[PDB]
Every structure is written in C-alpha cells, then in structure tokens.
Amino acid sequence: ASSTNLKDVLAALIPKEQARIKTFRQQHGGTALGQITVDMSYGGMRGMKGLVYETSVLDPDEGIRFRGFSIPECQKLLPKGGGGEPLPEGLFWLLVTGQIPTGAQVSWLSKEWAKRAALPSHVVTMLDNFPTNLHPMSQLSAAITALNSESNFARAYAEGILRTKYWEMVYESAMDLIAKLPCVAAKIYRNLYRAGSSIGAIDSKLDWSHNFTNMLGYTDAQFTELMRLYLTIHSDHEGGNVSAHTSHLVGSALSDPYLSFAAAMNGLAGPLHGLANQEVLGWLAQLQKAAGADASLRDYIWNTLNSGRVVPGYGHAVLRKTDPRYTCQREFALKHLPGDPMFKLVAQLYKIVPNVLLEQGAAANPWPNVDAHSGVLLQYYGMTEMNYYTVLFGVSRALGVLAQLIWSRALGFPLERPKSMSTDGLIAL
Amino acid sequence: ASSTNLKDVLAALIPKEQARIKTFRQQHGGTALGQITVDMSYGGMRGMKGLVYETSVLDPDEGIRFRGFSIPECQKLLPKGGGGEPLPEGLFWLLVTGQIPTGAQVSWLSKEWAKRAALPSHVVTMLDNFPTNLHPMSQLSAAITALNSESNFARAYAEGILRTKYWEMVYESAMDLIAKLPCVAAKIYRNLYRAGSSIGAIDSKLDWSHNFTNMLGYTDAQFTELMRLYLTIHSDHEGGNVSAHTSHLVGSALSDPYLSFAAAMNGLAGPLHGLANQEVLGWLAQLQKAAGADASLRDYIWNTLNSGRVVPGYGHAVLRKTDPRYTCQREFALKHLPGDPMFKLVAQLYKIVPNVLLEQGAAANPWPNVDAHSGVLLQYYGMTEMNYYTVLFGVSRALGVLAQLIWSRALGFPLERPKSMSTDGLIAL
Ligand SMILES: CC(=O)SCCNC(=O)CCNC(=O)[C@H](O)C(C)(C)COP(=O)(O)OP(=O)(O)OC[C@H]1O[C@@H](n2cnc3c(N)ncnc32)[C@H](O)[C@@H]1OP(=O)(O)O
Numbered sequence: 001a002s003s004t005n006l007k008d009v010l011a012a013l014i015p016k017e018q019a020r021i022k023t024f025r026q027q028h029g030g031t032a033l034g035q036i037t038v039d040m041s042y043g044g045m046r047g048m049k050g051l052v053y054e055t056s057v058l059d060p061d062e063g064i065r066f067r068g069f070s071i072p073e074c075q076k077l078l079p080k081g082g083g084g085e086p087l088p089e090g091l092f093w094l095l096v097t098g099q100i101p102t103g104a105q106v107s108w109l110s111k112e113w114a115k116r117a118a119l120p121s122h123v124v125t126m127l128d129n130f131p132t133n134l135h136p137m138s139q140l141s142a143a144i145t146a147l148n149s150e151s152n153f154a155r156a157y158a159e160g161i162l163r164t165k166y167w168e169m170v171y172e173s174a175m176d177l178i179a180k181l182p183c184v185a186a187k188i189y190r191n192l193y194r195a196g197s198s199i200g201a202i203d204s205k206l207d208w209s210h211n212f213t214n215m216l217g218y219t220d221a222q223f224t225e226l227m228r229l230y231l232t233i234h235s236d237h238e239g240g241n242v243s244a245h246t247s248h249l250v251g252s253a254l255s256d257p258y259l260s261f262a263a264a265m266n267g268l269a270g271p272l273h274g275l276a277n278q279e280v281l282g283w284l285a286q287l288q289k290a291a292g293a294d295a296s297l298r299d300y301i302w303n304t305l306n307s308g309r310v311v312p313g314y315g316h317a318v319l320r321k322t323d324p325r326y327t328c329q330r331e332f333a334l335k336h337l338p339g340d341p342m343f344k345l346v347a348q349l350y351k352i353v354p355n356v357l358l359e360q361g362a363a364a365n366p367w368p369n370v371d372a373h374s375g376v377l378l379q380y381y382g383m384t385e386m387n388y389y390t391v392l393f394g395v396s397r398a399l400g401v402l403a404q405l406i407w408s409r410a411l412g413f414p415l416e417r418p419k420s421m422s423t424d425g426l427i428a429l
Numbered sequence: 430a431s432s433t434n435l436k437d438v439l440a441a442l443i444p445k446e447q448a449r450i451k452t453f454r455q456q457h458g459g460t461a462l463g464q465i466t467v468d469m470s471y472g473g474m475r476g477m478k479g480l481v482y483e484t485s486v487l488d489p490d491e492g493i494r495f496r497g498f499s500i501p502e503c504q505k506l507l508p509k510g511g512g513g514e515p516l517p518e519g520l521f522w523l524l525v526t527g528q529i530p531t532g533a534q535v536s537w538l539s540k541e542w543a544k545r546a547a548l549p550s551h552v553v554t555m556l557d558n559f560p561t562n563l564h565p566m567s568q569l570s571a572a573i574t575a576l577n578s579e580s581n582f583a584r585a586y587a588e589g590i591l592r593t594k595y596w597e598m599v600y601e602s603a604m605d606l607i608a609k610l611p612c613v614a615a616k617i618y619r620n621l622y623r624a625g626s627s628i629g630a631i632d633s634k635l636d637w638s639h640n641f642t643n644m645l646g647y648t649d650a651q652f653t654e655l656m657r658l659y660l661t662i663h664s665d666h667e668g669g670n671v672s673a674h675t676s677h678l679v680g681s682a683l684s685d686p687y688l689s690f691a692a693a694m695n696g697l698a699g700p701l702h703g704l705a706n707q708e709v710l711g712w713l714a715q716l717q718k719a720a721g722a723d724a725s726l727r728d729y730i731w732n733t734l735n736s737g738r739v740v741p742g743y744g745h746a747v748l749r750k751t752d753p754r755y756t757c758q759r760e761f762a763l764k765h766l767p768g769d770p771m772f773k774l775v776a777q778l779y780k781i782v783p784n785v786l787l788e789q790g791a792a793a794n795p796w797p798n799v800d801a802h803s804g805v806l807l808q809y810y811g812m813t814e815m816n817y818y819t820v821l822f823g824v825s826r827a828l829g830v831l832a833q834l835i836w837s838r839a840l841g842f843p844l845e846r847p848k849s850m851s852t853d854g855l856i857a858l
C-alpha cells in the first residue's frame with residue numbers, strides 16, 4: 001500500500017547509514033588521512049581534509065559530482081519539465097537519497113513545496129519597510145533569520161525532544177525553508193525593481209522554478225528553462241565552500257535550519273564567494289564603458305591586477321581546470337544566445353584571462369569558475385539588475401546545504417569545534 | 430607631538446607582524462603540525478589544529494589567555510572604572526595590540542565608542558515592528574545584518590581599493606559596530622520588556638558598560654560592575670569556537686564586518702553554544718518547579734540524561750577542567766550575592782553534576798563551563814528575562830572576534846576553504 005513520501009524513504013535510509021558509518025569508524029577511526037602544516041593553517045585550511053559532507057564531492061580536475069553523477073549525467077538523468085532542463089526538485093531528491101528520482105517522485109517535491117509556501121506577516125512587513133539601498137543579499141538573510149519564529153526544530157528542541165529525532169524536525173524545517181525561499185526572493189525583487197506590483201500566488205500545478213519566474217515576472221519560456229538549469233547547477237559544491245561550510249558549522253551548534261541558512265547567505269555574499277556573480281557583470285559593465293581588441297582587453301586586465309584587485313569569476317580554491325558549471329553555462333548560450341554581445345565578450349575573455357593569469361604567476365587555478373558565466377545569461381533575458389544575482393545563487397544553494405543538514409543531524413555529527421593557535425604559540429611549537 | 434589613536438599604533442604594528450610571519454613561514458611552512466584521522470573528520474574537527482587566531486589562546490587545563498594574560502591577570506592589570514572590575518575597553522585594547530593599555534588609552538576607546546554610537550532609521554524601524562515572539566538572538570542578528578548598509582569596508586571594496594588597505598576599513602567598521610551594539614541590544618530589551626520606554630542617549634562621559642546599563646535601565650551600582658566583568662570575560666575564547674570561527678570563515682570571503690558578526694550570532698544562538706546561557710536558567714527554572722536533597726537533584730539530572738537531552742552549562746569541546754570563567758563568576762557571587770537561593774542551587778549542582786557526568790561515562794569534560802554561572806548573576810540583579818542572556822553574550826563576543834577580524838585582513842589571511850569528503854569517498858580512500 002501507499003503513495004510517495006521522502007520522509008519515509010529517509011527513515012528507511014538513516015539506520016543503514018548509521019550502522020555503515022559505525023563499523024567503518026570501528027575499524028578506521030584511528031587511520032591518518034592526512035597531516036596539517038604551518039602553511040595550511042596560515043592558508044585557510046587549503047588542502048586540509050577537514051569535513052565529512054555527503055551530498056556532493058568536488059574533484060579538482062573533474063569538477064563536482066552529485067552522487068557520483070556529473071552535471072552532464074544529471075543533465076540526462078533527472079526529469080525535465082516536459083522541457084530539456086533538469087528539475088531542481090529531482091536534484092534535491094537525488095541529494096537527499098543518493099538515488100535518481102522518477103517523474104512521479106519529482107512531481108511530489110513540487111506539490112510539497114507548493115503546499116509549504118507561506119510567508120508570515122512579520123516577515124512581509126520587514127521586507128516592505130526595507131531601504132532600497134539595503135543590499136538584496138542583506139535583505140534575504142535578515143528575512144530568513146526573522147523566519148526562525150517558525151522553526152519546527154527550535155520548537156521541538158525547546159520542548160526537550162530526544163537527540164535521536166533531530167533529523168525529523170530538521171527535515172520539516174528544510175522543506176518549509178525551500179518552499180518559502182522563492183517567495184522571499186521574488187518579494188525582494190518586486191519591492192526593489194517593480195514597485196507597487198505583487199508576487200502573486202503559488203500554483204500548485206507548477207514546478208518550483210516556474211512558480212519562481214512567475215513571481216519574478218518572467219514570461220519568456222526559455223528563461224524558465226534557464227532558471228531550472230541555474231538552480232540545479234548552483235545546488236551544492238561539496239562542504240568546504242564558505243556557504244555550505246557555514247551552514248554546517250552553525251547547524252552543528254543546533255541552531256535551527258533558518259538561522260544556519262541565513263549565516264550561509266552572509267558568507268555567499270562575500271566578493272570571494274557568491275558575490276562574484278555580481279562583481280563579474282559590474283566588471284564587464286566598467287569594461288565596456290572604458291567591441292575591443294584582445295590587446296586592449298589585456299591592458300584592462302593588467303590594470304585590475306596592478307591595482308591590487310581580483311579578476312572576478314576566475315580562479316578556485318579547489319578546482320584546477322575550467323569549471324564544468326561554466327562549460328554548462330556556455331553550452332546553454334551557444335544554443336540560445338550565441339550572438340549576444342555580452343556573451344561574445346565573455347567568450348573573448350576566456351581566450352585572454354587565463355593567459356594573463358598564467359603570465360602573472362599567482363593564481364593556482366587560472367580557469368574560469370561558475371560565476372564567470374551566470375550573469376551573462378540572466379542579462380540576455382532582461383534580468384539586468386546585477387546586485388540581485390547572488391540571491392538567485394542563494395536560492396539554489398539551499399538545496400544542497402539543507403539536503404546535507406538533514407544527514408548531519410541524522411548521523412549525529414557533533415559540534416564543529418577545531419583548535420586554534422596563535423603565531424607565538426605556533427612559533428613556540 | 431600628538432595624543433592617542435589606536436589606528437596609528439596598529440599601522441606601526443602591522444608591517445612588523447607581517448615580516449615576522451613571512452620568515453617563519455619561509456622556514457616552517459612545510460612543517461607538519463599534525464595529522465588528521467577518520468574520527469576527527471567525523472568528529473567536528475575535534476582535536477584538529479586548524480586555524481591561526483591571534484587574540485586569545487585556550488589552554489585545555491589552564492583555560493583562556495588574552496596575551497598570555499589569564500583572567501586573574503586581567504583582573505588585576507586592566508583599568509577599572511574608578512571600581513573593581515576591568516573595563517572591556519581595556520581588554521579590547523589588549524586584544525588588538527598585545528599590550529596592556531593605560532587609563533588614558535582606555536578613556537579613548539570609551540570616548541571613541543561614545544562618538545560612534547548611532548542607529549540608522551531603517552534599523553530602528555525594523556526593531557520596532559518586530560514580533561515579540563521573535564527571539565532576541567534573531568532580532569539582534571537581523572538588525573546587524575541590516576546595518577551593513579553602512580559598511581565602510583563594503584563601500585571601499587565596491588570602489589576598488591587595493592587589498593593592502595583592507596584592514597583599515599575593517600577597523601572603522603569594527604569600531605562603529607562595537608559602538609552601536611549596545612544601542613541595538615538595549616533597544617531590543619526595551620521593546621520586548623519595557624514597552625513604551627526609550628533607550629535614551631549615550632553620555633560621552635561614561636564607559637561603554639555604564640552607558641549600556643543606563644540604556645538597559647539599571648541603576649544598581651553593583652550591576653554595572655557585573656556588566657563590566659561579564660562583557661570582559663565573554664570577550665573572546667580563541668578561534669575554534671562556533672561564533673568566532675563563523676566570523677572568521679565568513680570574513681575570509683570578504684563579507685563586511687557587519688555580515689560576519691551577524692552570522693556569528695547565528696552560531697552563538699545554537700543550544701550547544703551561547704544559548705546554553707539561557708538553557709541553564711530554564712533548566713534551573715524547571716528544576717525548582719518539579720530546597721531539594723542531593724539525591725533528588727541527582728534523580729533530576731538522570732532523567733535529563735535518560736531523555737536524550739544535554740545538561741546545559743557542563744562540558745566543553747576543549748576545556749578539560751572547570752572553566753576559570755565559571756570560577757570568576759563564582760567568586761563574584763561569593764562576594765556579592767552569597768545567600769541567593771539560585772546561587773546556592775548552582776553551588777549545589779557543582780557538587781553533583783560532574784559526578785553524575787562521571788557516572789554516565791560519556792562527557793569527556795565533566796566540569797562546568799561559563800554558561801553554567803552567568804544567568805544566576807543577572808537574575809539576582811533583576812534581569813530575569815532568560816531568553817535575553819545570549820544577547821549579552823553576543824555583545825561581549827564582538828570584542829574578541831572583531832579584534833581578530835582586523836588582524837586577519839591585516840595579515841592577508843586567505844579564503845577559508847577546506848576539502849570535504851563523503852563517506853563513500855573516505856571509505857574508498
Ligand atoms: C561561487 C564561488 O565562490 S567560485 C569563486 C568566486 N570568487 C571569485 O571569482 C573571486 C576571484 N578569485 C579569487 O579571489 C580566488 O581564485 C579564489 C578565492 C576563488 C581562490 O582563492 P585561493 O584558493 O587562495 O587562490 P590561489 O591559491 O590561486 O591564490 C594565489 C594568489 O593568486 C591570487 N588569485 C587567485 N585568483 C585570482 C583572481 N581571480 N584574480 C587575481 N588574483 C587571483 C590570490 O588572490 C593570491 O594572491 P595573494 O598571493 O596576494 O594572496
């Protein structure tokens with residue numbers, strides 16, 4: 001008997017994994033997986049094997065994997081809306097469960113997220129009184145923090161539930177959070193860019209991305225497709241990246257999923273992180289201001305470098321080859337907006353940047369990352385408010401970090417609390 | 430020529446440290462400082478030497494140090510208001526500079542923080558519309574995120590400043606943040622607990638703590654003294670603790686100090702972290718509800734344990750002996766409120782808990798931590814709104830994390846981006 005329920009699947013999954021991790025540790029907990037050096041400690045744990053994070057694994061040369069599923073693999077394996085791009089819903093299922101969902105599973109996440117999407121009065125209020133000079137990443141983060149009012153986990157905790165059932169409330173809270181997110185994000189959008197307009201209602205018959213673009217105001221059918229891809233690809237990028245790591249660190253203290261997501265957004269908003277999204281367009285926007293020669297384009301790049309600034313959208317702490325996310329993006333444009341002048345510029349830069357970056361001899365990875373390509377795509381569709389882009393990143397990212405947050409609590413991961421040292425102390429060591 | 434300026438001192442300090450860290454790394458960057466195991470990775474980096482953090486170092490047996498200054502040492506060495514407890518101002522100087530400040534230095538931080546204390550309209554607004562069921566840690570965090578509007582660093586960055594001058598804007602932003610904090614915190618207090626009342630003005634002639642209690646509404650002279658100690662002791666606790674680590678992680682992406690502090694607060698609000706503050710009182714509050722026998726008190730404790738809950742305010746990821754912060758607290762009460770029934774209970778528990786905790790054989794550290802003693806002190810003074818306590822922790826903590834945030838940027842610390850692994854991956858490794 002019975003129809004679909006992610007929670008039921010998970011309940012089945014948890015105890016097996018549980019057991020599986022126990023014996024492994026029983027046999028290998030003492031095994032040395034690495035060493036730490038002085039440079040690593042000074043260098044942002046660069047290279048340091050530090051976390052267990054299950055939803056995705058990033059390969060230095062190959063790029064991100066979802067099970068072991070590459071982007072291209074997802075591209076073909078996940079269910080599409082009807083109609084060529086994978087549903088972030090399916091991705092989510094994939095992340096949570098390790099398995100490739102059926103259309104019928106997928107339809108359920110949609111329905112579920114459609115059902116959950118409700119904004120509370122205090123929140124709408126705050127969003128409506130916000131200043132327009134308040135950054136949208138700021139706006140997003142305060143709204144989600146403020147949503148914690150609603151936390152099913154924070155309530156359950158207050159009540160004194162047994163630690164074993166943590167995962168259960170975390171899941172409810174994750175699903176509600178995912179559900180609401182597009183409402184919060186579109187509300188911000190509308191407030192700032194479409195004053196006097198309203199987000200409208202969620203149509204339980206749409207996929208989450210389509211509901212999103214509707215609330216955002218986009219009618220173009222290809223844009224919905226872009227949105228579907230975008231939100232899928234930005235999903236997750238293993239645990240060591242600032243955003244995901246932040247959620248993980250904050251969640252380990254047993255701060256509810258709302259608060260953990262919010263902190264994460266605070267990290268996504270740094271220029272070295274998600275904000276690169278935005279920094280790229282603005283850099284391209286300056287660029288054009290000041291159809292150019294490769295040589296001038298080169299002068300332009302040197303000038304940033306000499307200025308002690310970074311070239312946005314190039315480089316990676318872990319990747320060492322061109323991001324497949326980038327490649328993915330490029331292939332979308334090559335299909336859909338191959339003559340876009342902005343597209344063309346971005347293509348052009350790919351020819352130049354890495355080279356200039358090799359010339360300088362400082363970046364360990366001279367290739368482009370996801371951020372280098374994402375704005376170009378949005379602009380083309382009419383979404384030209386660049387200070388907004390990172391919100392979109394913010395929304396996708398929820399899918400991965402929340403998916404993981406649930407396993408962490410499920411596996412009983414403890415407080416993230418490493419040891420620090422001072423220079424004096426280290427020097428003496 | 431000239432009078433006092435922390436920024437001038439720092440400018441002198443930065444380049445020396447700079448040079449000092451370069452050679453050390455030149456010689457020892459490759460030196461192995463440790464290994465990582467499977468258990469550490471599964472165990473929240475427990476035991477993992479992972480960060481360089483300069484302002485404070487925590488000793489497993491001795492407890493926290495400020496240079497190398499113990500709490501007792503600070504107690505005697507830092508300037509007092511007239512009149513026995515150290516000024517958090519002095520502490521701050523100490524943290525930033527490595528040196529013990531003069532009264533005249535100290536008076537400057539006071540003046541400076543008095544000058545900087547201004548709240549912006551959008552922020553007051555939001556605070557005033559907040560729901561009363563919105564947790565005060567929630568309220569605090571959204572307000573600080575929302576303050577980012579004002580970021581001098583975020584502006585400078587936008588503008589394209591050279592990376593070398595980062596520290597400079599970070600400092601301005603840190604000082605403004607410290608300045609405003611008590612305004613934000615007292616505004617929350619007043620809104621929730623003293624409806625229709627107003628925080629009043631900052632008197633440039635007071636120390637920061639005294640200004641705080643004024644805005645909070647406390648007249649008792651001993652309470653001001655408590656506040657001074659409290660805010661000093663909660664200052665900083667090396668870099669690996671959830672809050673400080675969070676600020677460090679988020680700041681490494683170049684998210685401004687406002688956003689980094691805010692995320693930190695999201696971590697301070699977890700039950701395993703700062704919220705223990707609050708959880709302790711509520712646990713003592715339940716306790717009393719249900720002058721008791723040691724034996725009943727023991728039954729009570731077992732019942733939590735059997736229930737899969739934690740005993741709040743006991744245990745530590747790093748300490749292995751009774752927190753000196755706790756001892757510090759106890760000695761204050763023994764001077765000032767030795768007959769308090771709540772005080773007496775807390776004294777009583779010290780006799781019992783650790784023992785029950787040794788009995789159970791799970792906590793690695795059976796001794797009490799800072800959180801076990803702090804609420805008792807506040808209650809006595811009339812501050813009995815427990816869901817508020819963590820805000821107070823929040824305020825102190827700014828002193829340490831911000832002090833460090835400035836050195837990080839000053840030393841050019843890179844993006845915090847460790848490597849993660851999945852179980853499968855690790856298993857295969
Ligand atoms: C969503 C995401 O976050 S993907 C990345 C988004 N961010 C960006 O696009 C920002 C631009 N890129 C960068 O700043 C970096 O490449 C990062 C942060 C992504 C990686 O940082 P790290 O792992 O420390 O990089 P790396 O090891 O290559 O650093 C070596 C040196 O090259 C510099 N370098 C690296 N990337 C760049 C870049 N894009 N432009 C200029 N210099 C760079 C580093 O800043 C550093 O300079 P330093 O020695 O004075 O400190």
Ligand SMILES: CC(=O)SCCNC(=O)CCNC(=O)[C@H](O)C(C)(C)COP(=O)(O)OP(=O)(O)OC[C@H]1O[C@@H](n2cnc3c(N)ncnc32)[C@H](O)[C@@H]1OP(=O)(O)O
Nearest residue numbers: 414701702705739740741742743744745746791792793798
């Ligand atoms: C401001 C500050 O954060 S100071 C600490 C504030 N927090 C608290 O007071 C919360 C209560 N204490 C705790 O939960 C813990 O002692 C912590 C989080 C502070 C340390 O966590 P860890 O370093 O992983 O602790 P430890 O290594 O002792 O854990 C061993 C086991 O003992 C348990 N244990 C530790 N402390 C406690 C406690 N106070 N009550 C009951 N059980 C405890 C751990 O939860 C764990 O149980 P598990 O094996 O089912 O996961």
